Design an enzyme around this catalytic site. Structure first.
Site, PDB file in Angstrom:
ATOM      1  N   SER A 211       0.566  -1.151  -0.064  1.00  0.00           N
ATOM      2  CA  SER A 211       0.077  -0.174  -0.059  1.00  0.00           C
ATOM      3  C   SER A 211       0.854   1.157   0.134  1.00  0.00           C
ATOM      4  O   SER A 211       0.401   2.365  -0.178  1.00  0.00           O
ATOM      5  CB  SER A 211      -0.935   0.186   1.165  1.00  0.00           C
ATOM      6  OG  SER A 211      -1.883  -0.940   1.096  1.00  0.00           O
TER       7      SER A 211
ATOM      8  N   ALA B  27       1.932  -3.376   2.708  1.00  0.00           N
ATOM      9  CA  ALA B  27       2.385  -4.741   3.058  1.00  0.00           C
ATOM     10  C   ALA B  27       1.452  -5.504   1.718  1.00  0.00           C
ATOM     11  O   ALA B  27       0.656  -4.965   1.236  1.00  0.00           O
ATOM     12  CB  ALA B  27       1.382  -5.140   4.305  1.00  0.00           C
TER      13      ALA B  27
HETATM   14  N1  LIG Z   1      -0.959  -8.535   3.158  1.00  0.00           N
HETATM   15  C1  LIG Z   1      -1.486  -7.477   2.297  1.00  0.00           C
HETATM   16  C2  LIG Z   1      -2.427  -6.575   2.935  1.00  0.00           C
HETATM   17  O1  LIG Z   1      -2.536  -7.021   4.525  1.00  0.00           O
HETATM   18  O2  LIG Z   1      -3.186  -5.703   2.653  1.00  0.00           O
HETATM   19  C3  LIG Z   1      -2.250  -7.981   0.912  1.00  0.00           C
HETATM   20  N2  LIG Z   1      -1.881  -8.951  -0.018  1.00  0.00           N
HETATM   21  C4  LIG Z   1      -2.092  -9.370  -1.261  1.00  0.00           C
HETATM   22  C5  LIG Z   1      -0.993 -10.352  -1.630  1.00  0.00           C
HETATM   23  O3  LIG Z   1      -0.079 -10.874  -1.110  1.00  0.00           O
HETATM   24  O4  LIG Z   1      -1.682 -10.933  -2.899  1.00  0.00           O
HETATM   25  C6  LIG Z   1      -2.983  -8.777  -2.211  1.00  0.00           C
HETATM   26  C7  LIG Z   1      -3.510  -7.452  -1.652  1.00  0.00           C
HETATM   27  S1  LIG Z   1      -2.667  -6.509  -0.447  1.00  0.00           S
END
Ligand SMILES: N[C@H](C(=O)O)[C@@H]1NC(C(=O)O)=CCS1
Length: 351
Positions: free
Chosen positions: A61, A308
């Protein structure tokens, strides 16, 4: 490199890596507007490839700061206005809950409870329209903030419509190229795969999965050198020669809403500096107060964003009044407080 910077950085990061078991990490400190780089560990544990200043990390992000600056540049171009209704740029969104939801609400997560994630079943332009038409807001627009990839994602996709360009093409030619971010990508090209770190989740090597509005909400990959240049650009937007980009950066650090000690920008989030460090959850709904009109970028701010993906944890923070910033990129998604604590521990020492 100045021993004071050497020392605070290594004395803070080495224990962080040990406590959090991070396989690889890159750090940039920007001190009096010059960058200093540091690397540790592995981009790819199995292949024994070290982190270098060339290694690509998933920003997760932190990508939203590039979306907010691209949206700010489209405003500066007179292509869009944040006060415009969403339906100006997507007139197919005819469902009546959309009346009154403006591009500002999308950009700042205040549309009324758009969800954190676009569902994984949404795979076409058609599926996307259906998702948004069916969504039922919990709240009236402009009353509560709920952080959401579906909110700022849709802002990014709509903000580039007047331009005629794909989101990726607009980002490439209006942000990455002008600022000389030549190793920053929405899609990693084959030529650059040798530098793409693996992320690590429960010990397994992983890369981000494709998903709708990914480029817009969480899909940029970059090196520590390009991220240091992004922090310099955002600390000193007046040095930028492209007028609408300089303006866009300023717009993205404007303060649009306040919740507690935090102010919401476009992608960026801000607190007044000096910032109490203890001031700096799957779903956290918070009522917001509108700043009417938004406050232009405040130089005495702690401006930051955490990011993340499943395998990566990133953090950027800078303080314009002190010409000081940091970028921390790691290939494990480790807790946000540990990122903030380390950053503040370095920047407070240097400030
Ligand atoms: N761990 C991330 C989060 O917490 O927002 C997300 N992970 C993922 C991913 O690892 O494909 C996609 C959308 S963001």
């Amino acid at each position: 490199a100045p021993q004071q910077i050497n020392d605070i950085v290594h004395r803070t990061i080495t224990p962080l890596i040990e406590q959090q078991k991070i396989p690889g990490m890159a750090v940039a400190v920007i001190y009096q507007g010059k960058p200093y780089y540091f690397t540790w560990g592995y981009a790819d544990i199995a292949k024994k490839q070290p982190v270098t200043q060339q290694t690509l990390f998933e920003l997760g992000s932190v990508s939203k700061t590039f979306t907010g600056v691209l949206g700010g540049d489209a405003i500066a171009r007179g292509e869009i206005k944040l006060s415009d209704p969403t339906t100006k740029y997507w007139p197919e969104l005819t469902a009546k809950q959309w009346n009154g939801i403006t591009l500002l609400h999308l950009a700042t997560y205040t549309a009324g409870g758009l969800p954190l994630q676009v569902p994984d079943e949404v795979k076409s332009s058609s599926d996307l329209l259906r998702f948004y038409q069916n969504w039922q807001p919990a709240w009236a627009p402009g009353t509560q903030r709920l952080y959401a990839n579906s909110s700022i994602g849709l802002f990014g996709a709509l903000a580039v419509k007047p331009s005629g360009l794909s989101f990726e093409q607009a980002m490439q030619t209006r942000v990455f190229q002008p600022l000389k971010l030549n190793h920053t990508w929405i899609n990693v090209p084959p030529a650059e795969e040798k530098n793409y770190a693996w992320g690590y989740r429960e010990g397994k090597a992983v890369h981000v999965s494709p998903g709708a509005l990914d480029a817009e909400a969480y899909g940029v990959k970059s090196t520590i050198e390009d991220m240091a240049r992004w922090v310099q650009s955002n600390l000193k937007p007046l040095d930028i020669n492209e007028k609408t980009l300089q303006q866009g950066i300023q717009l993205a650090q404007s303060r649009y809403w306040q919740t507690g000690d935090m102010y919401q920008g476009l992608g960026w989030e801000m607190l007044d500096w000096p910032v109490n460090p203890d001031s700096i959850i799957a779903l956290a709904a918070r009522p917001v107060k509108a700043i009417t009109p938004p406050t232009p970028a405040v130089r005495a701010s702690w401006v930051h964003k955490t990011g993340a993906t499943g395998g990566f944890g990133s953090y950027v923070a800078f303080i314009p009044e002190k010409e000081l910033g940091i970028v921390m990129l790691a290939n494990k998604n480790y807790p946000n407080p540990a990122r903030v604590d380390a950053a503040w521990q370095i920047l407070n020492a240097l400030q």
